[PDB]
Amino acid sequence: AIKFENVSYVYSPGSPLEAIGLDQLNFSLEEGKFIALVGHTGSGKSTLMQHFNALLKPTSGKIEIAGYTITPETGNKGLKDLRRKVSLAFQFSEAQLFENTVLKDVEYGPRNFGFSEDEAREAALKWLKKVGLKDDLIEHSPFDLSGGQMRRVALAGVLAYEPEIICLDEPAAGLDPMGRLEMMQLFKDYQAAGHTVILVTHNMDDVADYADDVLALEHGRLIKHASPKEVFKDSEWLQKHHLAEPRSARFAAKLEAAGLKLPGQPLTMPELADAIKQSLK
Amino acid sequence: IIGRYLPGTTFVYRVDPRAKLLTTFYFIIMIFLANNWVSYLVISIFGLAYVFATGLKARVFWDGVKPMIWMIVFTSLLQTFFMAGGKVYWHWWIFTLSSEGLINGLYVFIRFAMIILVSTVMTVTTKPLEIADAMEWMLTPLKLFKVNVGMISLVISIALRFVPTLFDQTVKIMNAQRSRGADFNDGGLVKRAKSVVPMLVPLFIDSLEVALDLSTAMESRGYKGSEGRTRYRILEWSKVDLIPVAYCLLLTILMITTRKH
Amino acid sequence: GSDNIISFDHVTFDSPRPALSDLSFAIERGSWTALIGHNGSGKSTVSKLINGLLAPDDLDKSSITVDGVKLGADTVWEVREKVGIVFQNPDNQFVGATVSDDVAFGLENRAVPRPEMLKIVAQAVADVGMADYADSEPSNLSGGQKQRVAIAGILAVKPQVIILDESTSMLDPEGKEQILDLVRKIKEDNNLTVISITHDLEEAAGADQVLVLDDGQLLDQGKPEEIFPKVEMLKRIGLDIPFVYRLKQLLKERGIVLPDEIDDDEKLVQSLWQLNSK
Amino acid sequence: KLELRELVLLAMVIAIKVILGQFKVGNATLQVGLGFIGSVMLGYLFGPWWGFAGGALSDLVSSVIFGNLGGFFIGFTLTAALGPMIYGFFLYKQPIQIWRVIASVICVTVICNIGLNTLWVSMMYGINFMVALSSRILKEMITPWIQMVAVWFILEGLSRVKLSRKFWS
Ligand SMILES: Nc1ncnc2c1ncn2[C@@H]1O[C@H](COP(=O)(O)OP(=O)(O)OP(=O)(O)O)[C@@H](O)[C@H]1O
Ligand SMILES: Nc1ncnc2c1ncn2[C@@H]1O[C@H](COP(=O)(O)OP(=O)(O)O)[C@@H](O)[C@H]1O
Numbered sequence: 001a002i003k004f005e006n007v008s009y010v011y012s013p014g015s016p017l018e019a020i021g022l023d024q025l026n027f028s029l030e031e032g033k034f035i036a037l038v039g040h041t042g043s044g045k046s047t048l049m050q051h052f053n054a055l056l057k058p059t060s061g062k063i064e065i066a067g068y069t070i071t072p073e074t075g076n077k078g079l080k081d082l083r084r085k086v087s088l089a090f091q092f093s094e095a096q097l098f099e100n101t102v103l104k105d106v107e108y109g110p111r112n113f114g115f116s117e118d119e120a121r122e123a124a125l126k127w128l129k130k131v132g133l134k135d136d137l138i139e140h141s142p143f144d145l146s147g148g149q150m151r152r153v154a155l156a157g158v159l160a161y162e163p164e165i166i167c168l169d170e171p172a173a174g175l176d177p178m179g180r181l182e183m184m185q186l187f188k189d190y191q192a193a194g195h196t197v198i199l200v201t202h203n204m205d206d207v208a209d210y211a212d213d214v215l216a217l218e219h220g221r222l223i224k225h226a227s228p229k230e231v232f233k234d235s236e237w238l239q240k241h242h243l244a245e246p247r248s249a250r251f252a253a254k255l256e257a258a259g260l261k262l263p264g265q266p267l268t269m270p271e272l273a274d275a276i277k278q279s280l281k
Numbered sequence: 282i283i284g285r286y287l288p289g290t291t292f293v294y295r296v297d298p299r300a301k302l303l304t305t306f307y308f309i310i311m312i313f314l315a316n317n318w319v320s321y322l323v324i325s326i327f328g329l330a331y332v333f334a335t336g337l338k339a340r341v342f343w344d345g346v347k348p349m350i351w352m353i354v355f356t357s358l359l360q361t362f363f364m365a366g367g368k369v370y371w372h373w374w375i376f377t378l379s380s381e382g383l384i385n386g387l388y389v390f391i392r393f394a395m396i397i398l399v400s401t402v403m404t405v406t407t408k409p410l411e412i413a414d415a416m417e418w419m420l421t422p423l424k425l426f427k428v429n430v431g432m433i434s435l436v437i438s439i440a441l442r443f444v445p446t447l448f449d450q451t452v453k454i455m456n457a458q459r460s461r462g463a464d465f466n467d468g469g470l471v472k473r474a475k476s477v478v479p480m481l482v483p484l485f486i487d488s489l490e491v492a493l494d495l496s497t498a499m500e501s502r503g504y505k506g507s508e509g510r511t512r513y514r515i516l517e518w519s520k521v522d523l524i525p526v527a528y529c530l531l532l533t534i535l536m537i538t539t540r541k542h
Numbered sequence: 543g544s545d546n547i548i549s550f551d552h553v554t555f556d557s558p559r560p561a562l563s564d565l566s567f568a569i570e571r572g573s574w575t576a577l578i579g580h581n582g583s584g585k586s587t588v589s590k591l592i593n594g595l596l597a598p599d600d601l602d603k604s605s606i607t608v609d610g611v612k613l614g615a616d617t618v619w620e621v622r623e624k625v626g627i628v629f630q631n632p633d634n635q636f637v638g639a640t641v642s643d644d645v646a647f648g649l650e651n652r653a654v655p656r657p658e659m660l661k662i663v664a665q666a667v668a669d670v671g672m673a674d675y676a677d678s679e680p681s682n683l684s685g686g687q688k689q690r691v692a693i694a695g696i697l698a699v700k701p702q703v704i705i706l707d708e709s710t711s712m713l714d715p716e717g718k719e720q721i722l723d724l725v726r727k728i729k730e731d732n733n734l735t736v737i738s739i740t741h742d743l744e745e746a747a748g749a750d751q752v753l754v755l756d757d758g759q760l761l762d763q764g765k766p767e768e769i770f771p772k773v774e775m776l777k778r779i780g781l782d783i784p785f786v787y788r789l790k791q792l793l794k795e796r797g798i799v800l801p802d803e804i805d806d807d808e809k810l811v812q813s814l815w816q817l818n819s820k
Numbered sequence: 821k822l823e824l825r826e827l828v829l830l831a832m833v834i835a836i837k838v839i840l841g842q843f844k845v846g847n848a849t850l851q852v853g854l855g856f857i858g859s860v861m862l863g864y865l866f867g868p869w870w871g872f873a874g875g876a877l878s879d880l881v882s883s884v885i886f887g888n889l890g891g892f893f894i895g896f897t898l899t900a901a902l903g904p905m906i907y908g909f910f911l912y913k914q915p916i917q918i919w920r921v922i923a924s925v926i927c928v929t930v931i932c933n934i935g936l937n938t939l940w941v942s943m944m945y946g947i948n949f950m951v952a953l954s955s956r957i958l959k960e961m962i963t964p965w966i967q968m969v970a971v972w973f974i975l976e977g978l979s980r981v982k983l984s985r986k987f988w989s
């Protein structure tokens with residue numbers, strides 16, 4: 001499980017430039033669910049992301065994650081075992097590929113966490129098969145690849161050791177629709193395997209379709225923490241807090257403005273189609 | 282740690298950056314001429330006047346001198362021991378505190394202090410873009426070699442713009458590598474040496490892509506070489522620039538008469 | 543009268559597959575022609591080839607003409623004055639040390655006297671919504687602000703064609719909307735032609751003409767209301783079906799019958815409302 | 821000479837050297853600055869003479885952005901320009917070998933770190949040459965043996981990068 005107590009992060013404590021990155025946060029994320037972290041630009045999503053693996057340590061806060069406890073005065077020793085269980089993929093993670101070989105780059109992850117020379121290789125091939133990258137592209141340089149293939153290699157690099165908690169910063173930003181859907185289904189299937197996925201994204205359609213919990217930030221302050229069918233229930237509330245709503249929800253709102261009833265809350269396209277079918281039934 | 286300029290309203294802030302840089306260079310050159318107590322007193326008075334004329338708190342000078350105080354102390358004491366002479370106050374195997382040794386140590390400390398203070402005054406009270414413009418202006422005489430100083434100025438301008446960006450990219454790359462188990466300060470000599478590659482190779486790739494994108498962007502906007510281009514950002518003189526001209530010139534007298542010929 | 547016209551041509555950077563192959567299209571004057579395709583379809587090379595950065599492999603049968611002048615090694619730096627491109631990455635193209643210097647880079651390159659440069663730069667910076675940021679450093683600006691600076695710099699030299707090469711891909715949705723609205727306002731005011739290169743079809747939904755590319759070949763061209771309904775072609779080459787047509791396809795599979803001319807969601811919702819009468 | 825794209829790459833490498841000048845690696849008492857790495861990049865990629873330019877400008881640029889608290893002086897600029905010149909002489913187009921790395925590091929630390937830097941510190945601060953050298957020689961005898969291994973691994977990585985689709989040769 002993941003749990004925050006009163007947490008604050010202040011950039012450059014003291015100093016004339018003292019920006020409050022995070023405000024008083026209090027939430028608990030249940031292990032094994034899909035969580036989508038949403039908010040406008042500059043809301044502190046990246047700081048909250050980095051707080052998970054103790055890259056950024058709190059200021060007057062307590063974090064309980066993967067059995068570990070992080071406090072403002074904790075040291076850098078022992079974070080090697082935390083970063084094995086809680087792993088973060090940053091935005092444009094394809095920029096981190098540096099190794100001589102695709103396979104070597106994928107297995108650079110597990111090897112750092114004590115994997116043997118055979119276990120790391122087997123995990124690396126397994127996840128290279130899973131991410132969709134085909135076989136002959138192995139033993140190639142990571143730089144002699146397409147953008148989508150480079151991103152697949154980068155994601156396989158951080159999924160290769162099976163971390164319990166994975167936090168993804170806009171994983172499918174620039175991919176094709178087929179690749180985007182493939183990556184989203186990969187993360188959903190990883191979540192269905194018992195692990196926890198925390199997604200930081202601006203796409204509300206993905207939040208409606210896949211997320212089980214929605215974590216809404218505004219100016220470093222947690223404004224809402226609930227299921228997607230409750231975060232997107234009030235359009236004016238979303239507009240006030242710089243939050244967008246699903247395109248399916250927008251169409252549902254327009255149809256209801258035309259007067260046609262729609263049972264439930266059609267946040268995704270199959271639900272909208274079924275709602276229309278029931279309305280005209 | 283990027284950015285050391287501290288805004289202020291005193292007349293030093295209005296001096297043209299070229300004149301301020303010339304004053305710094307000339308002060309460093311003139312420090313070479315100090316070899317007796319009179320000349321060191323003269324440079325001390327002039328440097329302290331230049332420091333007070335900025336209006337800055339002494340804390341900025343102290344912060345500037347902290348990184349080198351160990352070097353200053355070690356150099357001063359070793360010069361004191363190696364140039365010992367005259368009256369002896371404490372004698373050991375090699376350590377011999379002496380009047381001439383203390384005088385030489387004081388001289389070395391004064392040279393260190395005033396070089397550091399003049400450099401801090403130049404750095405703090407000038408915007409980085411203006412220092413860049415002054416440095417590009419002082420590279421003008423190289424045109425007698427027919428070297429394209431336009432390319433030199435363009436390279437300096439582009440490099441100064443991209444240090445803040447590439448630094449943040451380096452931080453991002455280190456964080457991305459650390460998130461998957463990389464250790465950048467542990468593991469002994471060989472592992473520490475190996476750990477620099479995960480930092481450098483993606484940074485070099487980013488530099489390559491930035492170079493290609495910026496070259497295309499510059500070529501598409503009409504760039505065809507430094508020959509035949511006007512300027513938007515210019516440096517222009519004023520009356521205040523007569524202050525450094527006198528301040529140096531007067532100094533040039535007070536040293537020459539007073540130094541031990 | 544067409545602004546850009548290209549006769550069939552191909553370019554190779556050295557590579558077996560040419561990036562383009564017999565590409566041939568015409569672009570009107572005062573249009574919002576939208577260029578869409580795959581991430582390896584050859585759109586960026588088209589953008590770079592319009593202003594003369596790249597040259598066709600056989601000049602004897604290839605032809606590129608912008609604003610009535612035919613592109614050639616001698617004519618480059620004359621077509622490049624009439625068309626400007628805003629590239630994908632906001633900060634990689636930011637060359638100046640400040641906003642004013644970045645805007646003034648293009649005028650410096652043309653040996654404009656400084657007294658006129660000051661006025662032109664001030665007016666160009668005021669045309670976009672960044673009048674007070676005339677001294678901000680590149681690192682103090684967001685992606686949308688840097689794209690505004692790029693558009694202002696392009697607008698300073700007064701081009702006749704603006705090519706937005708996936709300019710809004712790396713911005714937040716509100717930044718995307720703000721930049722697109724700013725570009726539309728500038729196009730209306732200065733009477734320009736805008737060629738928008740984009741991956742998602744939402745931007746192309748408002749275009750006056752749509753060009754779709756695949757493997758370096760022009761697969762189809764026409765109005766967005768006639769390109770989008772061919773959903774099978776869009777799915778074949780892997781492109782995002784726009785919202786209304788995708789929803790109409792789902793209603794088709796659900797058994798609901800709608801006219802094929804249905805378009806932007808207001809018409810769709812009113813069609814469902816009129817169907818609800820029975 | 822260098823085309824526009826190569827000039828922008830030279831500016832990128834200058835910025836990389838300036839940034840690496842601020843990065844230290846080591847324990848609580850023994851720390852080595854990574855600046856030498858940048859110098860190798862200026863010698864391996866752009867040759868002996870252009871690296872010299874990249875050596876000089878990197879000293880100006882850093883002094884502009886991080887402050888030259890060691891005194892605004894042209895001798896340190898000459899040293900920072902002379903380093904990459906030797907690195908380029910030893911490593912520009914030749915295949916990566918152990919003896920080239922050894923020789924380049926030794927020659928750079930003998931001519932630039934020992935010698936020129938000691939001479940200019942002595943001239944600036946009035947102390948004679950032996951006083952300046954005795955106050956330094958510990959670092960210039962410890963650091964090169966680390967710079968050797970670091971340069972070997974950096975050259976391996978950069979040779980890996982150069983032979984790719986990214987680099988435009
Ligand atoms: N410098 C280069 N050398 C060789 N081939 C290249 C180079 N740059 C691109 N290509 C190739 O040329 C083809 C055309 O790519 P292009 O850049 O036109 O695509 P795009 O999807 O329009 O790009 P963008 O995303 O920038 O809009 C691709 O197969 C690409 O891999
Ligand atoms: N390196 C930094 N130094 C100081 N302040 C920062 C830094 N990075 C971010 N901030 C501030 O902290 C807040 C958190 O922003 P961020 O976490 O980047 O939000 P997002 O991830 O949504 O862009 C921002 O409003 C920004 O002003």
Ligand SMILES: [Mg+2]
Pocket residue numbers: 045046091169
């Ligand atoms: Mg983010």
